[PDB]
Symmetry: C4
């Protein structure tokens, strides 16, 4: 039966039938958003969904016989597996992000369709060249997040009260998001020199970030 199904699975029809369902379930998921649409055709699309979920597990079963070990060493397939598994965790119990994480199956449109895979791959490939810098920065953040917690967290605990809070705030300063009127002018009403912490933080972090883009512009 193997070559029979290996011929079904590898069929152009099959790959296109899946791509056809993704665009439908994506279109159908934009509709589940509408409280109006749901009052009318809610029962329709709850079923249609569970239907596609089966079809997708059947496929993942079919795809596994045909590829076996080869399949659990394919990034795009591994993905597809975990993304369908999520969609299988009952519409109940645990966390309800699991109900929400179901929308991640629409990323299969990236998986199932080449050129996308190409483009995603193109992107992902740039990351290893970035890991030295990314490491450097995270060390830097960690170091500064610590200083700030112990320098401003007493008076300013919303923003710096906890190590995690300082991380969030420092991230916000890095994106240069409302950094002065939002964080540093306030801080300075109590700690006049806080500028001595943040201006250097800004230079270094933006400098590094310029460098990193230039590196991605030469590899």
């Amino acid at each position: 039966m193997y070559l029979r199904i290996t011929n079904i699975v590898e069929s152009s029809f099959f790959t296109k039938f899946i791509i056809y369902l993704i665009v439908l379930n994506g279109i159908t998921m934009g509709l589940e958003t509408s409280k109006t649409f749901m009052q009318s055709f809610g029962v329709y699309t709850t079923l249609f969904n569970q239907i596609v979920i089966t079809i997708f597990t059947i496929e993942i079963i079919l795809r596994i016989y045909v590829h076996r070990i080869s399949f659990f060493k394919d990034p795009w397939s591994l993905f597809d597996f975990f993304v369908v598994a999520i969609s299988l965790v009952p519409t109940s119990s645990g966390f309800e992000i699991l109900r929400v994480l179901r929308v991640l199956r629409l990323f299969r449109l990236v998986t199932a369709v080449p050129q996308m895979r190409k483009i995603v791959s193109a992107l992902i490939s740039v990351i290893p060249g970035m890991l030295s810098v990314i490491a450097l920065m995270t060390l830097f953040f960690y170091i500064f997040a610590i200083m700030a917690t112990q320098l401003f967290g007493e008076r300013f605990p919303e923003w710096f009260g906890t190590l995690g809070e300082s991380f969030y705030t420092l991230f916000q300063v890095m994106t240069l998001d409302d950094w002065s009127d939002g964080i540093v002018r306030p801080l300075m009403e109590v700690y006049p020199y806080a500028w001595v912490f943040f201006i250097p933080f800004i230079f270094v972090v933006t400098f590094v970030m310029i460098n990193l883009v230039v590196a991605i512009c030469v590899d």
Copy 2:
């Protein structure tokens, strides 16, 4: 008479006459801005305006006899047709954007003056090589926009209450506009973990955009 007008239309004088009108009609449109000016020369200009609109339909009519089918296959010519067409819908009925969309005719200074054609074409030409990325992202936006509507739309309906609302908010976060103090800090007073949605969102989207600029800086 065909060649008579093909020599009128194709004449340098004809083109320079048109360009001359555009600059005048453009100057006059900055004047229609002044409620003061309109109270004095308001009548002067409304007529000046209907005049140029005629002169331009005459030209488009002329330009078409000289080119026939070659014309409705020229971007720049097609443009001026539709742009002049907008300005033909009577000053009344329907929507009032049509009255406002008239000033689109000043883009004819781009259409009728070389160099601008060069630069605009330079620009437009870059877009095809971005279509793979642009799609990747729009798929991404669509996915996240759905996640956010169902994760935050009950408590935060201004920002995430509807799929389209979420598009806009997500757009704003992506342009890194007031994202933390404006949207996520508020969100977190109710959903402590919202940062788990927006920081990853910020990374991907900022990553992708650097790559896109670096790609353009290759092609």
Copy 3:
């Protein structure tokens, strides 16, 4: 006496003496900032200031005899004349920005010291290659500034009430400065679709600007 002074003017000591005065006068101007310093040594400083202003006119007089026409065809010389000229209009009358525009003489440090000249020249030289795009942009801004004034200036005159206000507001959206929570979200409370005006505006302008940087990242 000509070659005598041409040997005075062209002397290393002369130039270095001038550069000496620039850095001294520049330091003195930072001190003129202090309301304290001025109560103490304000008199000390205003005389030294007028002294420097004399010396500089003397120099500029001398420099011209030694170059004649050659001088008023030197950008950097023209600058120095026009900068020293500003500092010559008496401490009284007309516009008082003239008292303030005096501090522009510290740009003589760019003018009198090479390498700076190099760097400045390096920068300025990039400009000609940008003028087609800068023209493109100004036309774009002019067209949208007009549309916005007539679409929004009635309900929102602070931001769009006048052609000039719209220019300013459009510039601000372009710097992506507080654009959503500051301008468009407000606008939309009255004009739900204003997003159809600003998102396209934002795309084009940010596109064009990226193109301009890559263009510069090639020449």
Copy 4:
């Protein structure tokens, strides 16, 4: 005994033992952030800290015998000396930033591990080719900071009242942070033309910054 210790110090075990304390002390410093953690194990980790602080002085003492003058001409070594010395200044007297500056020792993970060393060095190396620009800019900032103090500091002392405040505010406009709704729109309520100061300042400064990135994307 020299070659004995020169074989202790230069050993793989030595180097990797130091790296072990850094990642341990660094972990231990994130924990001293928690006032919870400190209420239970505060005793443990103050001593652990003093332990590592001894070990680091012992090590720095050892490393100096092995290198003598060669060491005080190594940037990376000099660093570790200063950073350990900071951590020696008693947990008392003077200022409290010295207690806080202790966390700078976690930068030894950069110093004591290559690739980091490489990356940091790669970055720093880019700096000297920026110094003409960095200098140019600081002249410009100083000039405009002076102008602003005398144009806006009377009515607007929080933002432009003092030379240093003008520097800070100018920095913020340069990072394009809340500049319009935060500073210039306000300013314009009193000085209508303030846009004539900040728009040019924005152009020059944003221009220069683009040039500097393109420079770094050449060298």
